[PDB]
Amino acid sequence: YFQHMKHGRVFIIKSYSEDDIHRSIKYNIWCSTEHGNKRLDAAYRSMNGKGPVYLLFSVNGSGHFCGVAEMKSAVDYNTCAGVWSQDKWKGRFDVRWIFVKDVPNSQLRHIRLENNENKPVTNSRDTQEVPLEKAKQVLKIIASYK
């Protein structure tokens, strides 16, 4: 249960590669775009441990979110090249996967993001930030979905 969360920031991850998500679950690491890496680094560092950064993962075109992971370190920008599905993916940070489970978009699309033109949360791009009150609604639904 994620209702205890008073602080904390939540981002959507949209992957072109399901293989990269499988690698991320296996080794508890992730990376993002050049902009996404800077956005997440800033958010993690500004938290100063006062609350979590959660990542809500979804494979482009799958019609479902596939789980949730907590960001667990700052971004190292200079790391081994070519570990992901494509060479463009640079950098690395630790994550801890909290839920690994498929949740259909139909369960989530009523939740709209006031910072993204009131678009459904299921129509977000990679690294879209989610307002906390809408993030808690998404997390409650992922956690109790069966």
Ligand X SMILES: Cc1n[nH]c2ncnc(N)c12
The response to whether 72 counts as a known ligand-binding position is no
The response to whether 102 counts as a known ligand-binding position is no
Interacting residues of 19 by C-beta distance below 8 A, sequence separation 6+ = 85
Q: Which of 107, 102, 126, 106 minimizes the C-alpha distance to 116?
A: 126
Query: Is the CB of 58 or the CB of 136 nearer to ligand X?
Result: 58
The response to whether 84 counts as a known ligand-binding position is yes
Task: Dihedral sign for Cα 93, 11, 62, 116, please.
Answer: negative
- Residue 84 binds: one of Cl ion, ligand X, none (C-beta under 5 to 8 A by kind): ligand X
- Smallest distance, ligand X to C-beta of residue 30, A: 6
Q: Summarize as ranges the residues that interact with ligand X (CB under 6 A).
A: 14-17, 20, 31-32, 84-85, 89, 126
DSSP state of 114: T
Task: Point out the annotated binding site.
Answer: 14-16, 20, 30-31, 60, 84, 89
